[PDB]
């Protein structure tokens, strides 16, 4: 659908980049304002660093995935430097927010709350037939009202039938990704469940890097023995047994996202 017809295309004028939130290889992210008043986040592609068609595939997938628990596509600018504009999240990434004064004061109740918002957001992704493939505290975003939404959809995909198989030479963060995804390059909403498992460990330990004293090969060798992550310090035994269904050996034994939500709501209100 062409750009002079795209309901998503905006004149670049309408925008005003104020504070750079970050920079890397692929460009920059900025808070700014749309037509003066509405706070937004703007991702800009560093020319030449990656393909504009691949930059925008994120935007195009988000056009299809709209739900309160998901960070919302506002608009795109599809020339000079290419912009992706979204809804603004005031409190930045979950993984950082959990380390701040405010984050550090959160009760376990509040945390189990947030965890259920994330599972909700994924129960949508689940049911629309998408997979995320990058689910971790760094790719959860926090609002001014301490709610949570799924972010970063770089790797997110619609599936015809259950399997998405990566290209043989692909690497993903070992500590967060499911054995079959690391090994066979096969991803399903069940892989994402496994990661969610790992993210639970990030919520409940605030910041921390999962599998505390272990290198990647040590972490692989342990899984293969039938071990899983050592009960994080101060992790209610319940939520741990939950991470444990998230880490079942066979994916089809791994639970749904709707069910995780369901359970996380009980844990939450039971406290």
Closest CB 159 distance from ligand KSL, rounded Å: 20
| E strand or H helix at 221 | helix 216-225
Rg (CA), the chain: 19
| E strand or H helix at 39 | strand 38-45
Q: How far is the C-alpha of 83 from the C-alpha of 85, rounded, in Å?
A: 6
Question: Can residue 91 be called a binding residue for ligand KSL (CB under 6 A)?
Answer: no
Closest CB 9 distance from ligand KSL, rounded Å: 15
Closest CB 151 distance from ligand KSL, rounded Å: 4
The closest of 98, 59, 68 to 199, measured between CA atoms, is 98
Task: Using DSSP, state whether 154 is helix, strand or coil.
Answer: coil
Among the listed residues 51, 92, 170, 244, the single contact to ligand KSL using CB under 6 A: 92
Residues annotated as catalytic are 134
- Residue whose C-beta lies closest to ligand KSL: 41
Q: How far is the C-alpha of 250 from the C-alpha of 146, rounded, in Å?
A: 34
43 assigned binding-site residue: yes
Q: What sign does the dihedral 258-105-176-152 (CA atoms) show?
A: positive
In the region spanning residues 60 to 89, those forming contacts with ligand KSL, defined by CB under 6 A, are 71, 84, 86, 88-89
Question: Can residue 21 be called a binding residue for ligand KSL (CB under 6 A)?
Answer: yes
Question: Can residue 15 be called a binding residue for ligand KSL (CB under 6 A)?
Answer: no
26 assigned binding-site residue: yes
Burial of 126 (0-12, 13-18, 19+ CB in 10 A): buried
Q: What is the DSSP string of 46-105?
A: PTTTS-HHHHHHHHHHHHH---TTBPPEEEEE-SSS-EEEEE--TT-BHHHHTTSHHHHH
114 or 263: CB nearest ligand KSL: 114
- Number of residues engaging ligand KSL in binding (CB under 6 A): 17
Q: How far is the C-alpha of 188 from the C-alpha of 165, rounded, in Å?
A: 9
Site string for ligand KSL, 118-157 (x = CB under 6 A): -----------------------x---------xx-----
45 or 239: CB nearest ligand KSL: 45
Kindly state the tokens that stand for 157: 């995909």
21 assigned binding-site residue: yes
Kindly state the tokens that stand for 71: 């960070």
In the region spanning residues 183 to 242, those forming contacts with ligand KSL, defined by CB under 6 A, are none
89 or 135: CB nearest ligand KSL: 89
Among the listed residues 8, 32, 93, 232, the single contact to ligand KSL using CB under 6 A: 93
166 assigned binding-site residue: no
Burial of 147 (0-12, 13-18, 19+ CB in 10 A): middle
**Which residues form the interface with ligand KSL (CB under 6 A)?**
21-22, 29, 41-43, 58, 71, 84, 86, 88-89, 92-93, 141, 151-152
Known binding-site positions for ATP:
21-29, 43
């Amino acid at each position: 659908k062409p750009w002079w017809e795209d309901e998503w295309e905006v004149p670049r004028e309408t925008l005003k980049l104020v504070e750079r939130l970050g920079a890397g290889q692929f460009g920059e992210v900025w808070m700014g304002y749309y037509n003066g008043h509405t706070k937004v986040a703007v991702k800009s592609l560093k020319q030449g660093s990656m393909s504009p068609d691949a930059f925008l595939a994120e935007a195009n997938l988000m056009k299809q995935l709209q739900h309160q628990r998901l960070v919302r596509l506002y608009a795109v600018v599809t020339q000079e430097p290419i912009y992706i504009i979204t809804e603004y999240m005031e409190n930045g990434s979950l993984v950082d927010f959990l380390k701040t004064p405010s984050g550090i004061k959160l009760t376990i109740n509040k945390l189990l709350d947030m965890a259920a918002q994330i599972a909700e957001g994924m129960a949508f992704i689940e049911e629309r037939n998408y997979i995320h493939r990058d689910l971790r505290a760094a790719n959860i975003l926090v609002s001014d009202t301490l709610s949570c939404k799924i972010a970063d959809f770089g790797l997110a995909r619609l599936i015809e039938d259950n399997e998405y198989t990566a290209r043989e030479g692909a690497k993903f963060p070992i500590k967060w990704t499911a054995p079959e995804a690391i090994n066979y390059g096969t991803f399903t909403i069940k892989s994402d469940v496994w990661s969610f498992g790992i993210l639970l460990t990030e919520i409940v330990t605030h910041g921390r890097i999962p599998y505390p004293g272990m290198t990647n090969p040590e972490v692989i060798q342990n899984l293969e023995r039938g071990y899983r992550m050592v009960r994080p310090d101060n992790c209610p035994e319940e939520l741990y047994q939950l991470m444990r269904l998230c880490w079942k050996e066979r994916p089809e034994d791994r639970p749904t996202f709707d069910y995780l939500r369901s359970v996380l709501e009980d844990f939450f209100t039971a406290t």
